[PDB]
Amino acid sequence: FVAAHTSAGKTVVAEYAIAMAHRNMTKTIYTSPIKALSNQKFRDFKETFDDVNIGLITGDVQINPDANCLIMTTEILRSMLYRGADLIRDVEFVIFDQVHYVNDQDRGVVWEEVIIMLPQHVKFILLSATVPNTYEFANWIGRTKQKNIYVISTPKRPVPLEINIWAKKELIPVINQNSEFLEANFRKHKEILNDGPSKKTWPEIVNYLRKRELLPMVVFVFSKKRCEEYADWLEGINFCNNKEKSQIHMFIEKSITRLKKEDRDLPQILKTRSLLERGIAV
């Protein structure tokens, strides 16, 4: 059982498990609560491993069912166990990623049933983040399956984070990398300021951070409509000089070939293409 901070390198354990299974000529099953992550992990594993066949089993697709490495959803595994598939006899490792996202009601019963129904020759690898309820999951699994499981945790984040506040064309650091609040900086922030964004607000930020070599930016707006307005407010700003635009255009043109000819003229596609040529997206 591994419970480490985010961006600490949890995927190294899964890669080593897959390599061990390939060396022993056994099978591995990878499972995630969310179907969105399955495709991304499938692509990542296909790129990373060249001597190992990778498969995918979801409610929409089914690629290489006979491969030695399979990525599927929890309900797919539940149905497979209920049917009594013959490939389970060769499975050595089952990996559950993002365990801390399974504390829901619909996601909870299927996970417990899958854990209960698994045979005794299968070993477990568990990955998640730091959550208050960590020892209980491991204890329950080790009691139900009567197996030895080790709980491994990390002290702190390998990369540190800081919290700042922006006000009137400069940035005030108020929490440092040690998670210690700075009262004087907050007081100065209160003093210097003595509603919503304006039309000349996002340009005032896309230039200050650009000159500081901190360009890669993700802005969180809690509204579908406000994001489009904010993106449209950024006018006369570009990040592709002459070849990045051509490469992006080629990638977009090749990608949307799978659609029909009259389905590529939709306004959303045109607006996204126009925005993507300058390095801005929603």
Partner RNA sequence: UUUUUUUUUUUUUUUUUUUUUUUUUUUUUUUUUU
Contacts to ligand ATP by CB under 6 A: 6-12
DSSP for 6-73 reads: TTS-THHHHHHHHHHHHHHT-EEEEEESSHHHHHHHHHHHHHH-SSS-EEEE-SS-EE-TTSSEEEEE
268 binds RNA, rule: CB under 7 A? no
Is 9 annotated in a binding site? The answer is: yes
On whether 134 is known to bind a ligand per the annotation, the reply is: no
Q: Which does 12 bind (CB under 5 to 8 A by kind): ligand ATP, RNA, none?
A: ligand ATP
Give residues 19-48 in contact with RNA (rule: CB under 7 A).
35
In the bound state with RNA, the residue whose beta carbon lies nearer, of 150 and 222, is: 222
**Total Cβ atoms within 10 A of residue 234:** 14
Rank residues 5 and 35 by Cβ distance to RNA and give the closer one. Answer: 35
Nearer to ligand ATP, 99 or 118 (CB): 99
CA distance 119 to 138: 17
7 binds, among ligand ATP, RNA, none (CB under 5 to 8 A by kind): ligand ATP
Q: Does 105 bind RNA (CB under 7 A)?
A: no
Q: Which does 271 bind (CB under 5 to 8 A by kind): RNA, ligand ATP, none?
A: none
Q: Are the beta carbons of 7 and 157 closer than 8 angstroms? A: yes
User: Rounded to the nearest whole angstrom, what is the least distance from the CB of residue 224 to RNA in the complex?
Assistant: 4
Per the listing, tokens 């801005």 go with: 280
Q: What is the DSSP string of 183-214?
A: HHHHHHHHHHT-----TTTSHHHHTTTTTTT-
Stretch that binds RNA, among 1-9, 191-199, 218-226, 249-257 (CB under 7 A): 218-226
> C-alpha distances in angstroms, 121 versus 38, 55, 145, 157, 190?
25, 22, 10, 35, 62
The residue ranges that bind RNA (CB under 7 A) are 35, 59, 222-226
- Binding-site residue set: 4-11
Annotated binding site for ATP: 4-11
